[PDB]
Design a binder for these strands. Structure first.
Ligand SMILES: [Zn+2]
Length: 141
DNA sequence: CACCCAATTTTATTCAATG
DNA sequence: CATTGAATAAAATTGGGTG
């Protein structure tokens, strides 16, 4: 329910801003609503990802996102740590937008990746941003 | 534990065709 | 003139392995 609450909140935002994105503004009511549902559900799923997400935990740092910087340790006289190189300091892998793209092709079969990049992905990215911007949208819920 | 690197995937962009 | 899509290169990630 908290998940459904968050998704509906995102969906209201998405409907509000949908007019600004050529790939969705043109879509018919029901198809448009389903495309927005896909985009919001995937954006929220990505926002909620962590090292506890099955399969996501970085293999090299085991989720800490940290690793000793041996060159700096040797030249600075103390143990210095850097961001883990494999996960770029996150500790876990993200869900690429390509997953939402493939999900959306089930509703827009002729959607190509370049046209997705130009005309639909910006809405997806905006929904991810909105997840980060809204405190009420919880990453642990 | 942190690294290496080929293989693979993601991503935006070039260039030519469309309309 | 804007838009699109095949192709492509840069960047990100994965798989298999090591010192
Ligand atoms: Zn890591």
């Amino acid at each position: 329910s908290d998940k459904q609450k968050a998704i509906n909140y995102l969906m209201q935002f998405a409907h509000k801003v949908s007019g600004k994105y050529r790939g969705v503004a043109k879509l018919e009511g029901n198809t448009k609503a389903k495309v927005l549902q896909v985009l919001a559900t995937f954006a929220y799923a990505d926002y909620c990802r962590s090292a506890a997400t099955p399969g996501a935990r970085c293999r090299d740092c085991h989720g800490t996102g940290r690793a000793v910087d041996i060159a700096k340790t040797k030249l600075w006289g103390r143990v210095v740590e850097k961001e883990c190189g494999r996960c770029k300091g996150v500790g876990y892998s993200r869900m690429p937008a390509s997953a939402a793209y493939r999900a959306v092709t089930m509703l827009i079969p002729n959607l190509t990746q370049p046209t997705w990049s130009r005309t639909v992905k910006p809405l997806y990215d905006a929904l991810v941003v909105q997840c980060h911007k809204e405190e009420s949208i919880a990453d642990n819920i």
